Ligand SMILES: Oc1cc(O)cc(/C=C/c2ccc(O)cc2O)c1
Ligand SMILES: Oc1cc(O)cc(/C=C/c2ccc(O)cc2O)c1
Ligand SMILES: Oc1cc(O)cc(/C=C/c2ccc(O)cc2O)c1
Ligand SMILES: Oc1cc(O)cc(/C=C/c2ccc(O)cc2O)c1
């Protein structure tokens with residue numbers, strides 16, 4: 287799994303389940319092209335977004351729909367989404383885990399990058 | 403101050419000085435219109451971005467050039483930038499402080515929203 | 519200010535007001551000796567904890583009563599308290615700002631250390 | 635696994651490997667009794683600290699030796715350790731994952747609490 291996203295809920299102390307996210311890749315004309323999308327599982331994880339062959343060098347954006355998550359819990363949050371923009375694979379293939387820890391007015395995000 | 407941004411360095415335990423950022427506002431066609439910009443002071447703060455009259459309801463994006471900050475310290479960071487996307491002023495004017503705490507592979511952000 | 523503590527609420531997007539904390543200093547027998555205390559102001563800040571002359575080399579512990587803060591909001595939090603343990607003044611006086619960003623099941627803390 | 639701890643490195647974008655930690659439980663006389671200890675694996679995880687039978691209701695403290703971790707990388711960090719103090723199992727048995735995201739002058743920590 288070259289790209290995995292894990293989302294945690296800092297209010298409830300749980301994985302953030304059924305969180306939608308969209309991945310984009312910067313095109314040659316500097317526009318954001320749709321790349322992949324999905325929803326987190328009961329473990330707060332989204333696996334299977336891409337493959338080694340498809341996940342080429344580039345600038346990628348993961349846009350996590352935190353707003354819908356909070357609104358479904360009756361909370362009016364601050365952010366429209368949490369987004370993570372990064373260059374991937376520019377020194378050869380790597381495995382990326384993007385983690386996001388969510389609160390209504392705050393988020394933290396980190397990356398774990400491993401060389402297979 | 404209708405909109406202030408404060409940036410902190412989690413590696414050195416200091417304000418993040420001379421950090422550049424642009425602020426955009428979403429246009430009716432979903433493109434990002436230039437709205438404000440600047441760089442952080444020696445206190446890690448950027449004041450004077452906008453005025454109360456100009457800062458009306460909209461979706462705003464603060465795009466913080468964290469990559470240039472880390473590169474100046476000889477550190478190859480994960481993110482291209484840190485971005486904070488939020489609706490502002492939908493219930494009339496508020497004062498917004500956006501804080502960002504930076505590490506090479508991670509950032510945390512929070513908002514303090516106060517009614518004038 | 520030799521030692522200041524700032525506390526933020528990640529659920530409500532506000533300073534964390536009226537948050538109680540005690541500061542201890544490690545004694546020669548490894549017990550924690552009372553050193554300072556107070557509660558945060560309407561700005562979420564606690565100033566005036568110590569003076570430069572009294573604040574010498576030692577291991578200090580700031581114990582922030584986050585549990586009482588969340589319980590006052592009807593929220594059952596995870597932590598008994600947030601604690602920040604650090605050596606201070608080992609290279610002579612410095613000014614320390616300890617910031618804590620609170621959620622019910624999570625907290626983040628950072629330090630800003632400045633040379634007078 | 636009733637208690638698991640996961641530690642991540644925000645500077646290097648990696649699991650925090652070989653991080654020592656000590657777990658204590660508050661005794662009837664309000665002292666901290668040694669409860670368990672171990673070191674994180676190559677995945678940054680420490681499993682097997684305790685068992686369902688041993689992990690009774692109580693106040694627990696996880697003290698993560700972040701100082702030695704940073705010093706081994708040539709970094710003089712701010713904190714002596716990162717500590718997590720919490721009541722466990724007071725409504726019946728739960729499974730706890732404690733996560734900590736480490737930087738030299740900052741740490742974030744969260745808990746995921748699940749009912750088996
Ligand atoms: O506490 C810490 C930890 C750590 O990993 C690095 C530093 C200092 C970094 C640094 C790099 C380049 C430069 O021109 C100046 C600097 O201070 C301080
Ligand atoms: O943006 C958010 C999110 C969220 O989950 C809760 C709040 C407000 C909480 C609250 C609770 C008790 C009280 O007396 C006052 C309060 O404001 C605001
Ligand atoms: O651990 C963390 C995470 C994070 O996202 C922010 C902070 C501190 C933010 C901050 C905001 C306003 C202000 O006047 C001062 C501040 O330090 C601390
Ligand atoms: O306090 C924080 C802040 C933050 O941004 C992330 C975490 C947890 C991240 C995480 C990453 C990979 C994984 O397999 C599991 C995880 O829990 C904890």
Ligand code: NA
Nearest residue numbers: 375376377378
């Ligand atoms: Na290359």
Ligand code: NA
Nearest residue numbers: 491492493494
């Ligand atoms: Na409105």
Ligand code: NA
Nearest residue numbers: 607608609610
């Ligand atoms: Na010294």
Ligand code: NA
Nearest residue numbers: 723724725726
């Ligand atoms: Na009980």
